[PDB]
Design an enzyme around this catalytic site. Structure first.
Site, PDB file in Angstrom:
ATOM      1  N   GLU B  51       0.851  -1.221   0.000  1.00  0.00           N
ATOM      2  CA  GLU B  51       0.000   0.000   0.000  1.00  0.00           C
ATOM      3  C   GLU B  51       0.875   1.255   0.000  1.00  0.00           C
ATOM      4  O   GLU B  51       0.929   1.943   1.030  1.00  0.00           O
ATOM      5  CB  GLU B  51      -0.906   0.031   1.230  1.00  0.00           C
ATOM      6  CG  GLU B  51      -1.966  -1.061   1.239  1.00  0.00           C
ATOM      7  CD  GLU B  51      -2.858  -1.134   2.467  1.00  0.00           C
ATOM      8  OE1 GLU B  51      -2.556  -0.438   3.458  1.00  0.00           O
ATOM      9  OE2 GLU B  51      -3.850  -1.884   2.430  1.00  0.00           O
ATOM     10  N   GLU B 127      -1.829  -9.364   3.494  1.00  0.00           N
ATOM     11  CA  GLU B 127      -1.676  -9.640   4.914  1.00  0.00           C
ATOM     12  C   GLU B 127      -3.027 -10.067   5.459  1.00  0.00           C
ATOM     13  O   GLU B 127      -4.060  -9.508   5.079  1.00  0.00           O
ATOM     14  CB  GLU B 127      -1.157  -8.423   5.697  1.00  0.00           C
ATOM     15  CG  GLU B 127      -0.125  -7.579   4.968  1.00  0.00           C
ATOM     16  CD  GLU B 127       0.332  -6.386   5.785  1.00  0.00           C
ATOM     17  OE1 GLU B 127       0.349  -6.488   7.030  1.00  0.00           O
ATOM     18  OE2 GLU B 127       0.675  -5.348   5.182  1.00  0.00           O
TER      19      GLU B 127
END
Lengths: 397, 202
Positions: B51, B127
């Site tokens: 990100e 994740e």
């Protein structure tokens, strides 16, 4: 028997034969044009003229005229501005009149058909109706009458439409055959998306597609499909043509699907057979595919609907051909089903089977509802004919 | 492999990865990694960062990688993890059934993300399953979804080793951020290991 009306029609020697009224729109639906393609038959005279007039009620909005010239077919295109679109919420109706009139103007024969302005198309995996996604809260209306068998009349038809619209049902699938001709007219008038179903069913044959792959039955299947398409193309309520219910996926279904997509490309074609995911189907329509539980049958598996959505290389939208069996105190998992329908964008509802209870009146003289096997019939299927959201006399379940 | 690019704290996230003045630095940090680690057969997926915000530099670097070494899919989690700068859709902490519709970076339920229109790329969870002490919850739920759905291909349990530094009172005691006098810190958020720092199994 003879379970529908017998009529006598008289026409002059020169007559209007066939006419298909299609519609296309711009991006914002503000501008649209009407294609009132018209054909005739008989002796062709240069003085013959045709006129297509569009009346929004008692007021004429658009019109056009043209002589013949196919020497028996003439194309007219009528531009319409800010049209009152058609949807199940708003049944806006345009009364288009086709006239076969003389050169000096005397009228020979005039024919008209109600025409609605709507668009049905598939993109990105969503069924768009007038630029908006659809939520099919359908129902499988079997044609049945408590005191007349399969004879259907206007009072019963209107009352069924009233009850169906009073309970947020905005979709109907004639199961499994084209319905009475006035049914579609009433559907346009009230606002109800219909999924016409060609009268093809060979479930009991072993295997299922032993007939729909033999090219000796292509004539019969083509008749049963093409006559329905030609008769019911003009109506705007009919949105999805269905080639049958699980009739087994052979080659005749591919041929007929391509024929329909070649004749009327304005409507998606659904067909449930052969796992409901073949090339003979635009709208994936499995039967009783459960929400989360998986049912992996050989060659006809019932995936969980979400897994069916997440299948590799699959982009077509999913509507449930049949779901939520309404056997008496039943309609269970409905919510679960509606939760999935509301969560998942490419899952677009189903057709609650079925509407009217197929019960015949038996007299002991007290009438008592009966099922298969109570008339001495054998073999039968007992109470499996009792799956209605309302009774035969339309008392709400 | 994951290129060393992280600008999470910058407001907005992609204020840097869209300015074409940082293309030199980002290209160095990506291309040197690719060139150094291309030969190894274990490395299967190149990842352009976690990100870091989806600008234009990430599109440029993704195309450069796909032009240099076309034998490996390229994943990148930023910008909703579904941009054109990503071959392997890799969202962070996308829950199984619950939906988390955030503005411009939503966290769909993973099955909904699979069933998105016009979406055909496979999904692996960048994740998931935070292992904060007595945690690793929903793992099963997660593994049930992984086994049911063919195009959902597992995730990466974060994280392996506990980032604890030894502090002497002389008895060693594991410490976290803020126990060295550091400020600002993030307390015990640095303790997410499946095993301790000395590799005693949790």
């Amino acid at each position: 028997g003879i379970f529908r009306d017998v009529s006598l029609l008289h026409k002059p020697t020169t007559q209007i034969s066939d006419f298909h009224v299609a519609t296309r729109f711009n991006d914002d639906f503000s501008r649209a044009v009407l294609e009132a393609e018209v054909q005739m038959c008989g002796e062709l005279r240069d003085y013959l003229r045709v006129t297509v007039s569009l009346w929004q009620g008692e007021t004429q909005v658009a019109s056009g005229t043209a002589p013949f010239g196919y020497a028996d077919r003439v194309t007219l295109r009528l531009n319409v501005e800010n049209p009152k679109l058609w949807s199940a919420e708003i049944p806006n109706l345009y009364r288009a009149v086709v006239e076969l009139h003389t050169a000096d103007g005397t009228l020979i024969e005039a024919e008209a058909c109600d025409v609605g302005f709507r668009e049905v198309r598939i993109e990105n995996g969503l069924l768009l109706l007038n630029g908006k996604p659809l939520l099919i809260r359908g129902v499988n209306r079997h044609e049945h009458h408590p005191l007349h068998g399969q004879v259907m009349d206007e009072q019963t038809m209107v009352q069924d439409i009233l009850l169906m619209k009073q309970n947020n049902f905005n979709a109907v699938r004639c199961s499994h055959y084209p319905n009475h001709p006035l049914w579609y007219t009433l559907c346009d008038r009230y606002g109800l998306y219909v999924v016409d179903e060609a009268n093809i069913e060979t479930h009991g044959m072993v295997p299922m597609n032993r007939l729909t792959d033999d090219p000796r039955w292509l004539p019969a299947m083509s008749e049963r499909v093409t006559r329905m398409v030609q008769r019911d193309r003009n109506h705007p309520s009919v949105i999805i043509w269905s080639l049958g219910n699980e009739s087994g996926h052979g080659a005749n279904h591919d041929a007929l699907y391509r024929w329909i997509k070649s004749v009327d490309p304005s409507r998606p074609v659904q067909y449930e057979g052969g796992g409901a995911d073949t090339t003979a189907t635009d709208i994936i329509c499995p039967m009783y595919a459960r929400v989360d539980e998986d049912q992996p049958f050989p060659a006809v598996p019932k995936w969980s609907i979400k897994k069916w959505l997440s299948l590799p290389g699959e982009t077509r939208p999913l509507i449930l051909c049949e779901y939520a069996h309404a056997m008496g105190n039943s309609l269970g998992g409905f919510a679960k089903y509606w939760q999935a329908f509301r969560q998942y964008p490419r899952l677009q509802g189903g057709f609650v089977w079925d509407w009217v209870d197929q019960s015949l009146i038996k007299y002991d003289g007290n009438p008592w509802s009966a099922y298969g096997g109570d008339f001495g019939d054998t073999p039968n299927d007992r109470q499996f004919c009792m799956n209605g959201l309302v009774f035969a006399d339309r008392t709400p379940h």
